[PDB]
């Protein structure tokens, strides 16, 4: 029910125990999950897991009420050892966002730790269709 | 200690407050986290961690003086705002390896916080000037015994 990660601070570099709670409440629905039924998504995910074992399949979509640029393609294969912060910056560059513009990631309504690898995120939060679902917004709470 | 009274006009409603201030009766709670790191470092780190993970609050947990209770391995936590104080109580209970009949008491400013509240509410109401929330824990109900 509770998972923990460890992350050094950027200013005071001792390690935080970053607590994450499973099954958090949120309001977001994914248009990928509405345009494709479960079994179709699962077949696609299984085949892409067989083709690319070194990478995890991630769906990235804009959050409700978020005023921020659109993302052209929403399906990504990310190397397991790429950290969540690196993929964060990749998505920042793909949305063509100024360095001072805010971007927040949500995995089951929880901002993931920047220290973690995409492999860890996938292992801990991939759905039954073998996809990892990330939402993004410009504010810390979407749907507002 | 000392109990002082002053007078101060209000900002919006300009009648006068009788401002009571307590010089060490009770006194401030002391944390070794505040002793191993200077203020500017703690405050800048707290600002950065609130900007990085706004859905969580940064908490320092340390054992209280004279407390006869297990030690705590890690002392710096990032706690989801919507986690209730009792849930965090349970998390720390598990980290200390505590039996079902053993007491665990939290203290924020020498006061046992409300168990019903969320950690976000506690932080909003009691975070210090370094953007950290300081919780002490003990086996007795009064801080210092």
Curated annotation (Swiss-Prot), chain A:
Entry GO MF terms: beta-tubulin binding; GABA receptor binding; microtubule binding; phosphatidylethanolamine binding; ubiquitin protein ligase binding
Location of the region described as Interaction with GPHN in the Swiss-Prot/TrEMBL record: 63-144
Annotated site residues (Cleavage) in this chain: 143-144
Similarity comment: Belongs to the ATG8 family.
Example GO BP: mitophagy
Tissue: Heart, brain, placenta, liver, skeletal muscle, kidney and pancreas.
Region (Interaction with LIR (LC3 nteracting Region) motif of ATG3): 75-77
Propeptide: 144
General function of this protein: Ubiquitin-like modifier that plays a role in intracellular transport of GABA(A) receptors and its interaction with the cytoskeleton. Involved in autophagy: while LC3s are involved in elongation of the phagophore membrane, the GABARAP/GATE-16 subfamily is essential for a later stage in autophagosome maturation. Through its interaction with the reticulophagy receptor TEX264, participates in the remodeling of subdomains of the endoplasmic reticulum into autophagosomes upon nutrient stress, which then fuse with lysosomes for endoplasmic reticulum turnover.
CDD domains named among the record's database cross-references: Ubl_ATG8_GABARAP (cd17232)
Mutagenesis or variant effect for residue 81 to H: No effect on WDFY3-binding. Impaired WDFY3-binding, but no effect on SQSTM1-binding
UniProt protein name: Gamma-aminobutyric acid receptor-associated protein
Main localization category: membrane
Cell compartment(s), UniProt: Cytoplasmic vesicle, Autophagosome membrane; Endomembrane system; Cytoplasm, Cytoskeleton; Golgi apparatus membrane
Lipidation positions, renumbered (Phosphatidylserine amidated glycine): 143
Keywords: Apoptosis, Autophagy, Cytoplasm, Cytoplasmic vesicle, Cytoskeleton, Golgi apparatus, Lipoprotein, Membrane, Microtubule, Protein transport, Transport
Domain of life: Eukaryota
